[PDB]
């Protein structure tokens, strides 16, 4: 639907204007929303070119359709973020702004995925090559040529090989792999996650111990936020953190303090994260993840168990791994506000609530006196 791409242009344009504001003060540093959106628009025009005449193939293409749906949602969400946050947007350190940053990361991830599926504007998803032969077999085994699969399809397919303990691990995990934040998993996102958490053999264990349980891990963080967050530890060298690399999607980015008192960041090209992090502790560089005195022992990921509590998965999610999700289920979008208390949640948890556990709010117990529908929580 050109009407689809049209409609989406108008919205993206509105976001560009909002973001061009002088009071906002965006730095050109990746991820840069002011490049991301016109770039996305331009790739989409490319694709539209290739399918002139053969536009029904496109109309049938599930991925493109799903992509457009999510492109609209996210721009609409960014537009209302500006409306609800108002003057907050111009405060560098505000939570509404922080949310702007997160959306910049998502737009970045989305574009990466779009080009990876329609490179040169040509649908090559049904021909996509996963990097790890291990993971690649898993996908074609479970999903054949599919480009995307609903999260739940994916969760149950994955479960038969790598055991997923609970609904919290599953939500902590979805938060990690679902980069486009749309409850689908694409062959592409699959690809990145399996790259980031190699080897496939100990996939979830690596993820658990590297992402979930590791306090050096920063979810949804950018190069500049890293360099920003290691400021209080400029004076405590060996302080380090890490996050997904944004420009080299699928790779890691360790930021760290030096004895010199400056902040560098590096991308291990091949070598696996725990090894990189092991040698790194060893050779005296990465010693204090997020400034804390105790650095985790990761040997054995190279080969005993130990367990992540529900408390811990709840922390990981609570601490920004999720984007605009209900804090109750950590699964559904926050789409509703409770009055008078003002607490936000998804309608799925609220409905289940009012009908089974009674008229009080889930977080604070105050009587639900009314409801406003919402599209974004600038303070998520």
């Amino acid at each position: 639907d050109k009407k689809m791409v049209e409609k989406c242009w108008k919205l993206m344009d509105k976001v560009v204007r909002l973001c061009q504001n002088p009071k906002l003060a965006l730095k050109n540093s990746p991820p840069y929303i002011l490049d991301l959106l016109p770039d996305t628009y331009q790739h989409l025009r490319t694709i539209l070119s290739r399918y002139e005449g053969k536009m029904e193939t496109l109309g049938e293409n599930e991925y493109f359709r799903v992509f457009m749906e999510n492109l609209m949602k996210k721009t609409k969400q960014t537009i209302s973020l500006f409306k609800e946050g108002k003057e907050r947007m111009y405060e560098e350190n505000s939570q509404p702004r922080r949310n702007l940053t997160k959306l910049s990361l998502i737009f970045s991830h989305m574009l990466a995925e779009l080009k990876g599926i329609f490179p040169s504007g040509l649908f090559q998803g049904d021909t996509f090559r996963i990097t790890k032969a291990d993971a690649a077999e898993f996908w074609r085994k479970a999903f054949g040529e599919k480009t995307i699969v609903p999260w739940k399809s994916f969760r149950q397919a994955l479960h038969e090989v790598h055991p997923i303990s609970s609904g919290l691990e599953a939500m902590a995990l979805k938060s990690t792999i679902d980069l486009t934040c749309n409850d689908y998993i694409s062959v592409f996102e699959f690809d990145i996650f399996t790259r980031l958490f190699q080897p496939w053999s100990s996939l979830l264990r690596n993820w658990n111990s590297l992402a979930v349980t590791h306090p050096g891990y920063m979810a949804f963080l950018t190069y500049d936020e890293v360099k920003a967050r290691l400021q209080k530890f400029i004076h405590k060298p060996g302080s380090y953190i890490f996050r997904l690399s944004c420009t080299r999607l699928g790779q890691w980015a360790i930021g760290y303090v030096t004895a010199d008192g400056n902040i560098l960041q590096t991308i291990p090209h091949n070598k696996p994260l725990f090894q990189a992090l092991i040698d790194g502790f060893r050779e005296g560089f990465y010693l204090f993840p997020d400034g804390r005195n105790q650095n985790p022992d990761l040997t054995g990921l190279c080969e005993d168990h130990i367990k992540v509590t529900q408390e811990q998965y709840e922390l990981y999610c609570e601490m920004g791994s999720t984007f605009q999700l209900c804090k109750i289920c950590a699964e559904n979008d926050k789409d509703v506000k409770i009055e008078p208390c003002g607490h936000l949640m998804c309608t799925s948890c609220l409905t289940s609530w009012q009908e089974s556990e009674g008229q009080g709010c889930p977080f604070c117990r105050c009587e639900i006196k009314g409801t406003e529908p919402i599209v974004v929580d600038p303070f998520d």
Partner: peptide, 9 residues
């Protein structure tokens, strides 16, 4: 300062 450096010694 704004770029990615090689992995430390």
């Amino acid at each position: 300062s704004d770029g990615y450096t090689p992995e430390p010694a």
